[PDB]
Every structure is written in structure tokens, then in C-alpha cells.
Amino acid sequence: NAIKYLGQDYENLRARCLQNGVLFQDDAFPPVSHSLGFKELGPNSSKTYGIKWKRPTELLSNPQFIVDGATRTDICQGALGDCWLLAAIASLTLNETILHRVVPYGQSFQEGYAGIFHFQLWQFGEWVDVVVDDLLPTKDGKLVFVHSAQGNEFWSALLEKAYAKVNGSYEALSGGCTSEAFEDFTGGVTEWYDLQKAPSDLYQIILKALERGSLLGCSINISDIRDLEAITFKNLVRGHAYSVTDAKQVTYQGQRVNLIRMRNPWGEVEWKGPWSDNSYEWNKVDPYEREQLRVKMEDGEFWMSFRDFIREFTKLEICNLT
Ligand SMILES: *[C@@](O)(C(=O)NCCCN1CCN(C)CC1)[C@H](CC)NC(=O)[C@H](CC(C)C)NC(=O)OCc1ccccc1
Ligand SMILES: [Ca+2]
Ligand SMILES: [Ca+2]
Ligand SMILES: [Cl-]
Ligand SMILES: [Cl-]
Ligand SMILES: [Cl-]
């Protein structure tokens, strides 16, 4: 069993709040500006001033912890520099086993609800259980930070809040390393690859990792500083964490082509080159392959050929488990 972060005991706190007729408020990460941040989200900042802390049960009549499963579409980035963390959460959802260690079963806004949730992280060399109250930063009734494409679903907002808590504040999450979040979800071994010096068998390495449920992420280095914009000519975002979510092969005019699928944790803004949702390449594959693989949706997720992938991206990170 996970040991309790700060000695806070989820089931005991929940049961005592229920008995006492109150909702949990977390002394260890309270609903005040110091939990938001210190500079950009400090007590005297423009961003801090508009934010009000509200529970999902104050926002909606029927809030849900999980709706139609805990999946990657549930990860839509808000106003914070935590793309690395969110890419890691999106990847985590592809492995049901490790997903449900991090996100314990049986949490809800219905029977037994007392305004407290918990998650498990690999921290301080231990598996630790971390509680949060469900007060969330909002503005005009909408979540400021991570949210689900399903507007009534809250597990990912709550997980991001627990991760903020262990790190001291939401602002503490701005700017980071995908591999760090990978490790914090698995206690696994991380490795990275320089895509400009990719091993000849890299695609097979990727296939194998995806098969075993390893976590994969990629990024494009900003080499000049930010000159050719944050966004590239083909609509990729530089200095930004993407989740790698699949690797599949297609028959393009009678010849195999290796493809790779990734997801922008914004839940929008995608590659517009070959193999993108609207590209001509799909016209020339097996109709079945097209129907199985292509999804015409602005959802942040898209395909590239492996060839284009290794040209456009610069870094690949893989976290391997047991
Ligand atoms: C990352 O790209 C990010 O979080 N961007 C925020 C985008 C804001 N969205 C835009 C869309 N709308 C709808 C919602 C708001 C982030 C920006 C800093 N990138 C990273 O953190 C980098 C990830 C790597 C995989 C490239 N890492 C990084 O910048 O490292 C810096 C660093 C390292 C150590 C300590 C501090 C900072
Ligand atoms: Ca969902
Ligand atoms: Ca898409
Ligand atoms: Cl407490
Ligand atoms: Cl304040
Ligand atoms: Cl629920």
C-alpha cells in the first residue's frame, strides 16, 4: 500500500467530513493564492485577481469524476506551462494498469462524496497517496487549468491539482521535463533519443515500447530562440511536449509506409503536412486502413510518416516499466 503524503489519510478524512456534515478543505494545499503561485500567479498578479476557487459540485448539477473512461481526450491544457505534465498524463491513459494505480478506482461526486479525492504518485523514492479537496481554480465558471473535452468530467483537473500540491503550487509546474512526470507516474526507467542521430531500428523500438505500455513523448527544440515563431510553418508547436500515442503502417499506392501518431495536450492545433487529417495521402491507402486509422477531428491528435517525424521533431523520450 502507498504511504500517506504528509500523513494525510484519505479514507479517514473523508469519513470524518461525512460524519461532521462538511466538505474537506485541505490545510496542506488550501484554496488561496499561495497554492496558485508566487510571481506570475502570485497574490498581486493580474492572473491571480480574476480566479475564484470553486468545487465541481458548485459549478454543475451533475459533475462526474470519470465519463466514458479516463482517456487522452480528457486532457486539454489550460493557462499554465505544464505541457510536459499533461503529455505524460495523456500517455498514461493508454496503459490501463498504471493509469488506475495513479487514479484509484471508486471515486465519485455521488454516494460518499465529502469534497476530497486522492491519487498515487512515485515521489521521494516511495509510492505516496496524495489527497486534495476539490476546490479548483475557475474564472467565469470555467476551469483555468487542465480540463476535459467532456465539460462535466473532473478526474484530470483533480490529478493536475494533486501534482501541483506535491510541487508547491501550480506555478511551480510551468516549464518542465516530460520524463520527470513519466517517472513520477511509474518509478520506471527513462531514456531519450536524438532524432537527428536516430538508430536505424528506432521505429521498431517505438513499436515495442507502445506494445508493452511504455510512455512516449516528443518535442521540437527551439534552436534559434523563438525566431520562426513558437508555431512552425506546418502548425507544429516548438519547445512543447507532445504525447506519442500510436505507431501503425499503411499501404500507400501498394508500398508500406510507417506512420506515427501523436497528440498535442492542448486538445487542438495539429500538423498540416502529409498524413494530417485533411491531407491527400489518405486518398491512396487501403480504404479499411483509412477507416481504422484516420479520424477527421480537431482534437490535437494526428499522424505523420516516420520519415517526416524524425525530420520535424528533435527529441523522443521513452519511459519503460516492468
Ligand atoms: C509547454 O510548451 C506549455 O506548457 N505550453 C503552454 C501553452 C499554453 N496553452 C496554449 C493553448 N491554450 C488553449 C491553453 C494554454 C511548456 C512551455 C514552457 N514547455 C515546456 O515546459 C518544455 C517541455 C519540453 C518537452 C520541450 N520544457 C521547458 O521549457 O523546459 C524549461 C524549464 C526546465 C526546468 C525548469 C524550468 C523550466
Ligand atoms: Ca473521459
Ligand atoms: Ca486530429
Ligand atoms: Cl489534513
Ligand atoms: Cl490573495
Ligand atoms: Cl462521479
Side-chain angles (χ1 to χ4, degrees), residues 262 267 270-271 276-277 295-303:
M262 64 184 73
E270 313 183 4
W271 170 247
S276 60
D277 291 359
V295 178
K296 276 182 150 192
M297 276 176 74
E298 180 69 11
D299 54 10
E301 187 159 71
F302 53 87
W303 300 89

Side-chain angles (χ1 to χ4, degrees), residues 65 103 119 138 148 181 236:
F65 190 66
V103 179
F119 301 88
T138 69
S148 180
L236 297 172

Side-chain angles (χ1 to χ4, degrees), residues 24-314:
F24 185 56
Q25 295 184 75
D26 185 1
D27 287 336
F29 197 57
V32 297
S33 57
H34 295 159
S35 304
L36 298 175
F38 52 94
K39 181 178 171 76
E40 308 299 333
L41 284 157
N44 299 121
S45 73
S46 296
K47 298 176 160 72
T48 299
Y49 287 145
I51 289 171
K52 298 175 173 189
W53 293 79
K54 293 183 186 164
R55 302 179 193 263
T57 50
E58 289 168 332
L59 297 174
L60 298 178
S61 182
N62 186 32
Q64 292 293 135
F65 190 66
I66 294 163
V67 181
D68 294 321
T71 72
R72 57 194 188 285
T73 52
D74 298 354
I75 303 302
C76 296
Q77 185 165 4
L80 186 66
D82 72 332
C83 53
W84 54 279
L85 171 65
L86 303 182
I89 303 173
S91 287
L92 181 70
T93 72
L94 297 164
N95 181 334
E96 152 212 53
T97 294
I98 190 52
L99 170 73
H100 282 295
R101 186 174 174 100
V102 169
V103 179
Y105 287 117
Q107 305 187 69
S108 84
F109 296 95
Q110 296 90 49
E111 173 72 333
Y113 170 76
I116 185 178
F117 295 83
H118 71 123
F119 301 88
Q120 306 204 330
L121 299 178
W122 173 254
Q123 288 292 266
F124 320 114
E126 301 280 6
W127 284 102
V128 304
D129 193 80
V130 180
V131 308
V132 289
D133 66 51
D134 59 345
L135 289 151
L136 292 160
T138 69
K139 188 168 184 296
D140 303 323
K142 305 289 179 187
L143 294 164
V144 176
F145 305 126
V146 81
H147 55 275
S148 180
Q150 182 65 38
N152 68 325
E153 176 175 43
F154 294 89
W155 73 269
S156 59
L158 292 157
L159 176 53
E160 181 188 55
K161 186 189 178 179
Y163 199 95
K165 171 173 177 172
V166 305
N167 290 280
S169 65
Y170 280 100
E171 185 170 1
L173 305 185
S174 293
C177 313
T178 315
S179 284
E180 286 187 19
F182 284 171
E183 289 155 3
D184 293 355
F185 296 140
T186 63
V189 183
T190 47
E191 66 195 10
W192 74 281
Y193 296 84
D194 178 343
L195 295 183
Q196 277 70 64
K197 295 184 177 193
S200 52
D201 63 339
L202 188 55
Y203 195 70
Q204 287 295 144
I205 295 172
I206 289 164
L207 284 169
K208 187 166 192 182
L210 286 163
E211 164 71 40
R212 51 148 90 98
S214 298
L215 309 181
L216 299 80
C218 55
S219 61
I220 305 157
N221 185 45
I222 301 176
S223 278
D224 215 314
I225 204 288
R226 42 158 258 190
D227 282 352
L228 216 55
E229 252 78 346
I231 303 190
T232 78
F233 290 110
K234 300 293 173 293
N235 214 39
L236 297 172
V237 195
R238 305 168 175 106
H240 182 60
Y242 289 77
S243 308
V244 171
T245 60
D246 210 343
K248 289 287 185 290
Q249 303 166 107
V250 296
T251 316
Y252 177 71
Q253 310 192 229
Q255 172 240 359
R256 199 225 314 125
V257 172
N258 293 156
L259 306 190
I260 186 162
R261 192 183 68 180
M262 64 184 73
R263 178 178 190 278
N264 184 347
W266 298 353
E268 57 175 30
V269 181
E270 313 183 4
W271 170 247
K272 301 288 164 177
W275 301 105
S276 60
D277 291 359
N278 293 152
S279 68
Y280 284 130
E281 283 76 12
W282 295 104
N283 293 336
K284 300 182 181 301
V285 302
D286 179 73
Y288 185 70
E289 287 170 352
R290 183 188 312 115
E291 75 194 75
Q292 294 299 309
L293 298 182
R294 184 194 59 189
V295 178
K296 276 182 150 192
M297 276 176 74
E298 180 69 11
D299 54 10
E301 187 159 71
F302 53 87
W303 300 89
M304 306 174 70
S305 65
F306 188 65
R307 166 186 34 73
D308 286 350
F309 169 74
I310 66 179
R311 185 189 67 247
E312 298 289 342
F313 286 80
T314 58

